[PDB]
Amino acid sequence: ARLAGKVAIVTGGVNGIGLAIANKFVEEGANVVITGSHALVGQKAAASIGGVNVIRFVEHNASDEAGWVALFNVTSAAFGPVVTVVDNAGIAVSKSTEDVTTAEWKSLLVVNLLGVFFGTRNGIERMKNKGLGASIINMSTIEGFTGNPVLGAYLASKGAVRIQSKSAALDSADKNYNVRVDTVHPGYIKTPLVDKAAGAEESMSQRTSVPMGHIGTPLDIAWISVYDATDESKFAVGAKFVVDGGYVAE
Amino acid sequence: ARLAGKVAIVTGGVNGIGLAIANKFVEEGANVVITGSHALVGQKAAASIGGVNVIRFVEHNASDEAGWVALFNVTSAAFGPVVTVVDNAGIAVSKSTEDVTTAEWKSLLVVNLLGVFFGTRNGIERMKNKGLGASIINMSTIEGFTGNPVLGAYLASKGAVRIQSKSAALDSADKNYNVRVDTVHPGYIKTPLVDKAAGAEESMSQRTSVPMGHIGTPLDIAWISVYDATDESKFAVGAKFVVDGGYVAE
Amino acid sequence: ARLAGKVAIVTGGVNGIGLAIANKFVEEGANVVITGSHALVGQKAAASIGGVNVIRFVEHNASDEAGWVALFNVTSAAFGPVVTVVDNAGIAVSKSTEDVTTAEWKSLLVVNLLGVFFGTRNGIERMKNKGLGASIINMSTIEGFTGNPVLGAYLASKGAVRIQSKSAALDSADKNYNVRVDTVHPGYIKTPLVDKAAGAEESMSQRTSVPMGHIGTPLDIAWISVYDATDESKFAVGAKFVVDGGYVAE
Amino acid sequence: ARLAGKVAIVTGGVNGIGLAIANKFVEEGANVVITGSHALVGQKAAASIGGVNVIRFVEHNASDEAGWVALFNVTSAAFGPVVTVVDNAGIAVSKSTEDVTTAEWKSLLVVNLLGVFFGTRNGIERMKNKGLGASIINMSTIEGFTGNPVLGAYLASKGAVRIQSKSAALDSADKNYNVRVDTVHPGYIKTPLVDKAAGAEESMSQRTSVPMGHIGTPLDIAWISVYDATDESKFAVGAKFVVDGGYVAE
């Protein structure tokens, strides 16, 4: 019951970290809408967690600005006023800054940065001043703190989310909106996508990368997001929550 | 049951933040030893939370190096192997660096820095390699991130705890000790000590200090410490967890 | 002679910080191209510093991707191979995240983020592997470290520049390109634009904003950029250089 | 002439980084006192740079509190009022937190932390309110930002110097003392001590440690310290200046 009465939107909620967030949110009493681009993936994901009284899928691309107000409307029609937004949808491009095409740059930033902007802006407007204990959780990354030579556009996007979220936190705090905004910074997490890239988990598990010598699992990110969605974290805003196996500590 | 089977030492556990940590640790199933300098304060504190099957007081000054191994022995005799150490004992001096006497400097660092060192070193030695899911939670502060012109020695101590904790985290991770080390960074928290200082809460609540316009409460720190003591945070090590009402975000 | 033989592009070099960078670069022996949107402003600016053997103006919008390779060509035709790129062009929008229009968001990011990307990508390609001691200096801000509730899009842009620059630094270092990339983070700086906003300098000079009690001047940013362009800083890459009167230290 | 009229104390100025700071300070017009523990090393060091009109050695242990006021007196008798203090003396212990003896802990902190405190406190008292453009440069390290599992006490000391320096910066700024305080954070630097440790330079030069693939040289730290001692950096206070070959950027 740590999220009793909460109503959450989790973007990119049909896979990996987003799916585990959705799963533990439902376990703790939240009602959840998960979004993703692919209907078969999303419908399967939602039903794996529960029935439509607690979780529903909505097909939505986080870069689709017009779809964001309709996503809030669909969620509110199902479950009542939204209290919690998890901006987790994202894509990755394996290119250095030098090698990034302008098309790749714009495509990644449209999801990773504009999508987080759209969800954060709308979340503040739709959740402020309602006594909801509202919480916006923006998914950055260890790549919001440190560079990676082969993730130039992804670093830009995660650095932007990191500091934009502080602006939003501050405005919400100063205006007594009853909205908190924080960032979560996963390290490497094992998912079916990582499993599809031969050698990725072993590269990520080297001690010079992750000092724990292994990578995490989606629930590792789900539990910090439960804390941040809950009223337990009512004094936490504008902060960065790193769950990375020690990556950024060295 | 989030701390089912855990056995915690909370230094400075008889007042304020430490007491609330102890309270919520017991609520989540931990057995707890709280320390403090003053027997009447400590005995009252322990009994306010529960009986001696779940919480006991031990009189101990965290600067007392010889008492630290005996504190572990007393805790283990009561409750079995220690899994969780919260290094929360600390003192404050209201002096600029310019105005700090060497006596004040040494007194504060003996508790705030040497005491955390003693608890962290001993905690690693006594908890490693036992499959306990062990966790060391070192209390830094917002004063581990930003200066305050009137808290020079306190800033030194909190900066030291911040980075020493990363060293310990890394060594524990690299050696597969099954010990995590993290820091918690409270902002301003309302306690009876703050209530005794006329005008302190209002100063701390100005928007140029805490953007939320009010200060926190001890449970705000207790709940992040429950997360960090629990196996929910098994991939979090070497990281800084800030709960400050937005103080450091501007 | 600290920049003997260097050839620099300074975007947004016709006003304020960029102009002072250009001025001190010429003083230290560099040849400089300054860019800006407005021909009369740019021509006056260039001639205020020196003749066309040491400084020239090129009209260019940093968001104009096709103009960037022509800007390098014009600079190289004048002065020989470019060694130094200062990505300083930028705009500001005074809006919270909540109040930012999508048009404002896209307009600011096209200059502040895409323009820095275009200059950094091209700079690496055109300066690598030539033994030039090449240096890319990306202008972030104190708003790359801390939020401001009324600068949401500007914070996003400066956070992105901060971390994208680390990616570029690392790739250049790992590949032995002989290119360094660093960020400069000015605090508040007095310029004619600040002088045009009634009350801005006094707001910025309050001790709760800038602890020095006054704001800086353009040369304060020029001298850190001379250090970073010079071979004196040959071991500095991927780092953040803050010149802010103490703003971020509290 | 970048340090025309400055009078500097450089602790640990007889070797390595401190010696190079002293050398470039003299080159830029400063008068310098270098300290060290060993008379033959110090006398040779001073004469290698210049005669006693510009540089003198004083034998002093930075942990020797009573010697610090006499060191200022000796410097002022030689050269007039001190303007610049570089707190560079330090020692290292290769131990994890777990393996650090209390004797090792106290010995290292007495030099690395108490010595910096003594020089910073005295520097503020002796240089404030004199129109000197005074500057205190505290030597932290990359180990003030990130942990190293084998440098536990050294990390504590460098984290403490990092944040204590911000307190001092702020107090000096707020009181209009005309004293700035900043930290410098070297990465790995080649010195005769590093050359005496078989395999150290190669370990430090691995790309997973220093992305540039080599370590720095003492002059790399000297030139950032010239910038910080000079009036060029009159708006820089409370900040961290990292010169590390990219170490902390990944």
β-strands C31-36, C55-59 pairing: parallel
Is residue B134 within 8 Å of residue B83, measured between CB atoms?
Answer: yes
Q: DSSP letters along B6-26, please?
A: -EEEETTTTSHHHHHHHHHHH
Residues in chain C: 250
CB neighbours (10 Å) of residue A132? 19
Query: How far is residue C97's CA from residue A128's CA, in Å, rounded to a whole number?
Result: 13
Query: How far is residue A194's CA from residue C163's CA, in Å, rounded to a whole number?
Result: 24
Alpha-carbon distance values, B124 to B118, C34, C175 (Å): 10, 58, 40
In eight-state DSSP terms, residue D114 is: I
Buried b (16+ CB within 10 A) or exposed e, C200-239: eeeebbeeebbbbebbbbbbbbbbbbbbbbbebbbbbbbb
Signed CA dihedral, C68, C70, C74, C76: sign only: positive
H or E segment to which residue C139 belongs: strand C134-139
Residues in chain A: 250
D184 contact partners, CB below 8 Å, separation of at least 6: D137, D138, D139, D140, D221, D224, D225, D228, D241, D243
End-to-end CA distance of chain D: 37
| Number of domains forming the structure of chain D | 1
- Give residue D105's domain range: 1-250
Chains with 3+ CB–CB pairs under 8 A to D are A, B, C
**Residue in C closest to B148 by C-alpha:** C250
C145 contact partners, CB below 8 Å, separation of at least 6: A163, C162, C185, C240, C242, C248
Query: How far is residue C220's CA from residue D237's CA, in Å, rounded to a whole number?
Result: 12
Q: DSSP letters along D116-142, please?
A: HHHHHHHHHHHHTTSSS-EEEEEE--G
Query: How far is residue B148's CA from residue B158's CA, in Å, rounded to a whole number?
Result: 12
Alpha-carbon distance values, D127 to B101, B152, C246, D81, D234 (Å): 18, 18, 19, 8, 15
* Tokens representing residue C115 in the block: 């323009």
Is residue D120 within 8 Å of residue D167, measured between CB atoms?
Answer: no
Is residue A203 within 8 Å of residue A190, measured between CB atoms?
Answer: no
**Residue in A closest to D143 by C-alpha:** A250
Chains with 3+ CB–CB pairs under 8 A to C are A, B, D
Query: How far is residue A90's CA from residue A109's CA, in Å, rounded to a whole number?
Result: 9
- Residue identified by tokens 């929550």 is A241
Query: How far is residue B98's CA from residue D168's CA, in Å, rounded to a whole number?
Result: 7
D153 contact partners, CB below 8 Å, separation of at least 6: B164, D93, D95, D97, D100, D104, D105, D108, D109
CB neighbours (10 Å) of residue C69? 13
A177: chain B residues, CB-CB within 8 Å: none
What is the set of active-site residues of B?
154
A204: chain B residues, CB-CB within 8 Å: none
- Say if the Cβ atoms of B146 and C208 lie within 8 Å: no
List the single residue in A216, A224, A236 with the smallest CB-CB distance to B243. Answer: A236
The alpha carbon of residue A94 is apart from the nearest alpha carbon of chain B, in Å, by 25
Query: How far is residue C12's CA from residue C37's CA, in Å, rounded to a whole number?
Result: 8
List the single residue in A65, A125, A170 with the smallest CB-CB distance to C149. Answer: A170
H or E segment to which residue C135 belongs: strand C134-139
Query: How far is residue B135's CA from residue B230's CA, in Å, rounded to a whole number?
Result: 8
Query: How far is residue B53's CA from residue B47's CA, in Å, rounded to a whole number?
Result: 11
Query: How far is residue D164's CA from residue B92's CA, in Å, rounded to a whole number?
Result: 14
The alpha carbon of residue D243 is apart from the nearest alpha carbon of chain B, in Å, by 19
Is residue C73 within 8 Å of residue C81, measured between CB atoms?
Answer: no
